[PDB]
Amino acid sequence: MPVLENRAAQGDITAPGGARRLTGDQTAALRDSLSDKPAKNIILLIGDGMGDSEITAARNYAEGAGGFFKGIDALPLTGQYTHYALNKKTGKPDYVTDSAASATAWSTGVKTYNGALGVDIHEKDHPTILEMAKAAGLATGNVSTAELQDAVPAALVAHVTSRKCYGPSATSEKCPGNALEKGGKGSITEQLLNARADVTLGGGAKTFAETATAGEWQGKTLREQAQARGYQLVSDAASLNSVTEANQQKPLLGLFADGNMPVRWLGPKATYHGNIDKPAVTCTPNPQRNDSVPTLAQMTDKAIELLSKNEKGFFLQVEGASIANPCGQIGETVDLDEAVQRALEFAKKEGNTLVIVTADHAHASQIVAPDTKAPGLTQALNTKDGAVMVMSYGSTGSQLRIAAYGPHAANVVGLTDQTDLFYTMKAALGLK
């Protein structure tokens, strides 16, 4: 079912027809994109805050208005999904979710309250798509450029009443029911190590320095616990590259930064009337990025290579993290686009892989007219077109894009809910 490159503007944008992204009728191409056959594998890519506005701004900046993201914009089947959370006491909708409640929704199929991971409004645990995959004998991967304790990667492996419960310390204080010494399943990091995905790659080494309060590994650091439990620990690109396999006997745990992994691009923070009062900005490469720290795309490719060895199949989630910094935000979308390209390249070759690309919720940034005097923070940027684009941040709940390629991708078209994504993945992989 491969392709639909490319949908850049096809010609001279000032001339009749020159800004078209299509070359002819799409009925055959869309029909050819539809298959009801089993998915052997799923790759779910999440861009933090990546709603339609963020996609557009990053395209305009990095590719030009008429440009095309070869990963993000190349998925043939598209829709919009709703991501409202719940008020914990009343059960009524809360129109603006945080990352934890939204990740819980696609990870478990149950709505919840802001801050919850893997539990419902009654604080009851519900299994995750990753746990279910593993129980069925599928290989599992969990990749992020955030700290691995952050809401999105955490939601696949941890059930806690507050997303703040990173390690033993915070869990004892803020989630006493989940604390290991109080009979609970443990902190986010402890539950991560119990879950034992085949491949886990990201930031967040800091919390692994904490020591367990109880159980078999009481008094040892969580890093020592991982080593004791047979994990392959890697911390840089060379150590990652040399890994030849990852499975339940030798699961891979890559910890590539103390906190979040390095942001792709730097620029100044937006300011009051920054588009008027400050020069237009050209984003710059972050010196902290280097070939010793794997990128999101490199971690995605290595996870695919290790997980694809499982004959039954795999589930892999990849999160492009977001750390009022337009350059930071746009470079994060570029990082995600490269990871999506790796996923699509694999899926097109393998032929039984469903790739889904979406966001937890949208950032508040807006693209505004160049002369805008806005009440919040603004910045002018010099885009690939050699024109100024202005972005405004003006302290969100909108539905936002979800797109897919491969078997069962029809289930993201039209209006859906974020919880439907759980059931789509469940059904595509034939999980019970």
Next chain:
Amino acid sequence: TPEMPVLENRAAQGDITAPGGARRLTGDQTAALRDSLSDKPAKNIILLIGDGMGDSEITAARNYAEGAGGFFKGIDALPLTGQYTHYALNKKTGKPDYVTDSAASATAWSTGVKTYNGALGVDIHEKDHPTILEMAKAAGLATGNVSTAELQDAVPAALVAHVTSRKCYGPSATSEKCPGNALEKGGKGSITEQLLNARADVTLGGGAKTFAETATAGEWQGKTLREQAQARGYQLVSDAASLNSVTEANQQKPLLGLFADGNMPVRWLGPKATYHGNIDKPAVTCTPNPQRNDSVPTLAQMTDKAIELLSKNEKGFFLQVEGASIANPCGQIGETVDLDEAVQRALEFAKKEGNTLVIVTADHAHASQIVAPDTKAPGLTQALNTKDGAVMVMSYGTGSQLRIAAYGPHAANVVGLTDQTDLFYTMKAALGLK
């Protein structure tokens, strides 16, 4: 048999607090979507435009009027969806201008050419290009142009007028602001004059005021534009009763309904948003506008009457319907509700007829955002009491790509990423126009 499927119910299917309760799907959609795809000719096209109606506006309106887990039986029911880009051009450089106005965006889908902000039916060199409505008429199709805005406003005007500035409503503004287009200066005339020349079978909306102006040259010099319409054989109507009496509309007796002096009445009233309004003022419940009444047809009623009149043409018809806009949350939400009712009419017709492509989108998105209730925001905000019995806060503090959705023959051409100019080529090809 009414047979390619419309989405009948994508509301949350159960108790939203329970596992699976917030699902909008009941099962796999592959078969449904396969059955949604045809490249047979479109006999008819109905294009519905919600002013400012990006994804945020759809979500806010759904939240308020239907609840978070509710469902717009029109807007949310189209099975094939994508996102399109609507950037304009800088007139002098020809480089993208990332934030369009309504005139440049309407020009893009009506003519397939990008242009500068404020341009109607002309490119950055001020050269005219034909519109989808003009092309439909030349091919023997019936044509309708319906709006709750003034008919001179950018969206309806872009189908029938080629002028260098959208401000050129009548003779007086054209001679001042678009001198090359002014009739007495050798051009094709004001927006209103070009509308009268274009002679769609059905034109319904606001904007009676400009018709009081007199022409400055030509056969009808010194007559008002209303008098000109009357002399050129138009059937003029001004309220619901007179619209209802109309039995036919065609090139001998084209229909021109003028239902307000300016814009037609908004659906709902509420207070303007204010600084720290969500904190400093009570949560708002929108109220009915008493200027709305059964003597003024609604957007849906105009849509239904236009379909009834246009569908008599054996070759087919092209119909555009605009739900107009105008930091008034209640006004903007009610406008989305108005559009949803008109989309329901269009889909009901299309489902039965079987050869009708229905497209629902926006010119460009409004700046409103849905934000946390406790938000202290620097712009204008308002708390609203929604259908769920919970508070939603709106903030007004744009260039984002936005939803386009379709049903019927050739609907596949809205899926994925497209440009607003592709919509011109989609409509052209679907109707077989050359």
